[PDB]
Design a protein around this ligand. Structure first.
Ligand SMILES: C=C(NCc1c(COP(=O)(O)O)cnc(C)c1O)C(=O)O
Ligand SMILES: C=C(NCc1c(COP(=O)(O)O)cnc(C)c1O)C(=O)O
Lengths: 313, 313
């Protein structure tokens, strides 16, 4: 490979035999991408597209609002391409992920005022618009509305999944924030497996699917606005999980399978444990594990954080 | 794959075009192994061997003295195999790596008394012998003396390198602690490229190759005893680098290539920059990048740690 860019994708798939002994449950390890998450795929895809089409030159200042993983992916790619980048972030970001963005030489704008229900997305978007107003040659990645987001997953893990799974897929389960992953992957999966059931896993208190908004702790799952790239008619079921439940799911996965994953992976485990009680034995379930446990030592893998979240419920 | 075990190995190789524009410098990304370092390979190899040969059963308590990466690899594998594990560690371990070992459910023994020159290896070995004396069914991985260590690298990255590089290899450069990586990989490389020059990169103050021992900060490179698996006649050149120089090398690599790697990778960059002044333009240099930058935010990627080390020199 001529660079790191060439090592994005083609991630491993494993079966979770120990955790789910009566079902065929397969997990795509997207956290093994070089930047450390699934978001490596939309970052590569959007930036290469923009350069090809004259939207992004060496003078273009990239801007994005992120809970952490897309900021890290964008900063890696920007280093390789010689581009400037400013990440707009909020106080809920993983402290580890905030320091990583800075080590990659990205500019950081940290907002401080949440809305009436604890969410910082409205304030992040406003900060982005302010940066756009004062930076002459700037390009907003705009992941909640950019069609290239779900397209990158259609061609990425979505395609790899249907190339690799040698049996009918009964359920596809994915966590949501922009819904790029689940829209893109499900669209590819259903071309081959048209009766596959599509299950979104979301945070309790996320308005994506119409919950009453409430303050959420874990970054990366859930949102306080409805993403524009979501098409609700393509989702068959929604399951909501809270911060405490997601943390328990992380800790059970590492105990049962030796897999050390981030918060939204815990949300997926907790949701699949709720789902399988209804599912015929032997059925095939496919999911994705978006990022690494490494980044959540002050959150999910902190016993005092765990105890704090248990009190909240 | 039936588990994570099956995703160990087959890591990417990239050329460092930007950093070394007049030479062909190839880097094996061993930090992309599932546990996060090269040490995944000896952990898998030694444990599978022991189980196959009746040295390790479900009742066997694994013990090892480690600067961090082998402890993490062993804890991942032990989870998957249902084995008990105690890691003996010292105050120089990365705080992040110490917390990861604990999240994987391993027991931890932290020693506290260094020898006359700041090294903790003598005390770690003593602690290991004490654990051996009081635990009835225990097996010491013993990585500084275990031949299975260098064998795992012969069959691992060593084999992959000679399968992948399509030109004569002029130099092979690797960092050392147990010397398992450099002994194993160089032995395989020289079967195909018998005139390749083998270059060890070591910490200043490491006694591995006979330096006067002095207090070293960065864990993972250097040692305060001579490893038994080292054969000095197989090494052509040795280059020593200090803590500050290694940190500068990490920061230059991420700036030039978008690669975010740990301390010993910085040592490799600093040594290769010293070496190439003597090397014919166009020559092929192969190296390995053992682990992730993620784990060194309180060390190499901390500006105050950086400033502390600059004062020391
Ligand atoms: C919105 C972003 N995160 C998405 C994300 C998601 C949601 O993926 P989406 O494709 O955005 O729906 C799940 N899990 C983790 C760990 C994530 O980081 C971001 O990185 O800025
Ligand atoms: C001795 C151990 N570390 C080896 C190591 C090395 C040296 O590899 P050896 O094969 O032990 O020589 C280089 N770089 C890093 C980041 C390492 O973690 C250990 O993980 O206990």
């Amino acid at each position: 490979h001529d660079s790191l860019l060439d090592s994005v994708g083609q991630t491993p798939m494993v079966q979770l035999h120990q955790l789910f002994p009566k079902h065929e449950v397969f997990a795509k390890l997207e956290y093994m991408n070089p930047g450390g998450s699934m978001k490596d795929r939309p970052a590569k895809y959007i930036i290469e597209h923009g350069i090809k089409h004259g939207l992004i030159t060496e003078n273009t200042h990239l801007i994005e609002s992120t809970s952490g993983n897309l900021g890290i992916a964008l900063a890696m790619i920007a280093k390789i391409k010689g581009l400037k980048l400013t990440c707009v972030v909020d106080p809920k970001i993983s402290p580890t992920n905030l320091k990583i963005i800075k080590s990659y030489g990205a500019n950081v704008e940290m907002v401080e005022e949440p809305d009436a229900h604890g969410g910082y997305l409205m304030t992040r978007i406003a900060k982005v618009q302010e940066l756009l107003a004062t930076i002459d040659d700037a390009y907003w990645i705009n992941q909640y509305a950019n069609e290239l987001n779900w397209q990158s997953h259609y061609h990425g893990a979505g395609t790899e999944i249907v190339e690799t799974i040698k049996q009918p897929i009964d359920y596809f389960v994915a966590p949501v924030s922009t819904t790029g992953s689940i829209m893109g992957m499900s669209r590819k999966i259903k071309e081959v497996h048209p009766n596959a059931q599509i299950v979104a896993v979301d945070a309790k208190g996320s308005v994506i699917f119409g919950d009453k908004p409430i303050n959420r702790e874990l970054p990366g799952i859930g949102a306080s606005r409805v993403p524009e790239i979501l098409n609700r008619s393509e989702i068959n079921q929604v399951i909501h999980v809270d911060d405490y439940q997601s943390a328990l799911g992380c800790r059970k996965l590492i105990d049962y399978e030796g897999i050390f994953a981030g918060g939204s992976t815990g949300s997926i485990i907790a949701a699949i444990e709720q789902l399988i009680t209804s599912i015929e034995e032997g059925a095939t379930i496919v999911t994705i594990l978006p990022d690494r446990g490494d980044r959540y030592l002050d959150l999910v893998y902190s016993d005092t954080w765990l105890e704090k979240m248990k009190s909240r419920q």
